[PDB]
């Protein structure tokens, strides 16, 4: 069976500014099959009360979903999401970046 | 509005 | 000026873990607008925008027909194709399904689609006459014989040409203040230091819909396709989309670069450079 691993991207929705309340993304794209595993993390622990969009796709047929959370970015809080999808071997951890 | 027929495949 | 409307069906096998589950999803554009999940407590159409919660219980209790009748056929579909391939019981397949109308800048229908797929892979498609099919291969054409028998392609022209189109035209006058609103991209070009003689200039959109959008870098005039880092448009979570585009410049030569945003919400094409 062909399968396709996702893409990663971490962000937020608005630009950040450190202590405003401001909202962590998770796209995920481009994976095939559909079922996917996918974590918020706050300091390496996975974040409870995260929302999905519902499951859609592209027109190459591959999957694309949208996790996101309510956070307020610091100085030395560490942001990430953690992905398993079975094109992957371990989970995929992708650090949230500022500038990215 | 979605289309109304549904056909096996 | 011109729109589209398109609903995506997902039916998933999952052997051991309960009956195949049916999704269909909405989509005006770049706004998603309806959900059914066969998979929820109760599986029902739900509005996922807020101009289609002014239609009536018809409507909701016959979209919901509709999806618990597909819920049911693709789940004999999956069955039939696991068959045509010669599967074992054991693995997850995924039938797919994309169709639905596009209008042009005059709400006058430019083409219909209907596409399906098996495990990622065309399967079957609607031609564009709306009249005849695309069969990927042997299993694809048993399909097909199933579908000119029952007239499918017949009843999908009258379906893409009629009521795609009307109620698509219904959506967008209901949906006006956000669907035929195109937002502009807010853009910056931010500056990072690689190394002494290299830095990354990245130019940004933010905030813009819908989702079609050109961000490109140049170079004295002249494009840097193989040299410029482009991220794929992602969402917001708010109705909008991101993106950015990004080069490795030789320090000092940061003024030979020039960024070039395209956007349906701008009053004119955007000109940026890094200002210091």
Redesign the interface.
Not at chain 3, 23 to 27: K, L, N, S
Not at chain 3, 234 to 238: E, F, M, N, S, V
């Given at each position: 069976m062909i399968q396709r691993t996702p893409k990663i991207q971490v962000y937020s929705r608005h630009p950040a500014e450190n202590g405003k309340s401001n909202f962590l993304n998770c796209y995920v794209s481009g994976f095939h099959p559909s079922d996917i595993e996918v974590d918020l993390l706050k300091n390496g622990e996975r974040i409870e009360k995260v929302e999905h969009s519902d499951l859609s796709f592209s027109k190459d047929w591959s999957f694309y979903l949208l996790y996101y959370t309510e956070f307020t970015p610091t100085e030395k809080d560490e942001y990430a999401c953690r992905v398993n999808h079975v094109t992957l071997s371990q989970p995929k951890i992708v650090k949230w970046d500022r500038d990215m | 509005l979605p289309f109304e027929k549904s056909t096996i495949m | 000026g011109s729109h589209s409307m398109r609903?995506?069906y997902?039916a998933?096998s999952r052997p051991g873990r309960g009956e195949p589950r049916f999704?269909?999803?909405?989509?005006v554009d770049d706004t998603?607008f309806v959900?059914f999940?066969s998979d929820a407590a109760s599986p029902r159409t739900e509005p996922?925008a807020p101009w289609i919660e002014q239609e009536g219980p018809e409507?909701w209790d016959?979209?919901t027909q509709?999806?618990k009748?597909?819920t049911?056929?693709y789940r004999?579909?999956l069955r039939?194709?696991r068959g045509y391939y010669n599967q074992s019981e054991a693995?997850?397949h995924?039938?797919?399904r994309?169709?639905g109308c596009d209008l042009g800048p005059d709400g006058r229908l430019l083409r219909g689609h209907d596409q399906?797929?098996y495990?990622?892979?065309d399967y079957?498609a609607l031609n564009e006459d709306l009249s005849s099919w695309t069969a990927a291969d042997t299993a694809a054409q048993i399909?097909q014989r199933?579908?000119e028998a029952?007239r499918?392609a017949e009843?999908?022209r009258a379906?893409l040409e009629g009521?795609?189109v009307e109620?698509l035209r219904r959506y967008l006058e209901n949906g006006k203040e956000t669907l035929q609103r195109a937002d502009p991209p807010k853009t910056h070009v931010?500056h990072?230091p690689v190394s002494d003689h290299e830095a990354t200039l990245?130019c940004w959109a933010?905030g813009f819909y819908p989702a079609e959008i050109t961000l490109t870098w140049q170079r004295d005039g002249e494009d840097q396709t193989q040299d410029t880092e482009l991220?794929?448009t992602?969402?917001?979570?708010?109705r909008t989309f991101?993106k950015?585009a990004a080069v490795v410049v030789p320090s000092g030569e940061e003024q030979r670069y020039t960024c070039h945003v395209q956007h349906e919400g701008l009053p004119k094409p955007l000109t940026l450079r890094w200002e210091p």
């Open positions: - | - | 609903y995506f997902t998933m999704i269909a999803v909405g989509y998603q959900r999940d996922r409507y016959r979209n509709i999806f009748t597909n049911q056929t004999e579909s039939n194709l693995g997850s995924i039938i797919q994309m169709y399906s797929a495990d990622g892979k079957i399909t199933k579908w029952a499918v009843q999908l379906y009521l795609c109620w931010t990072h990245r933010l991220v794929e992602r969402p917001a979570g708010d991101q950015w």
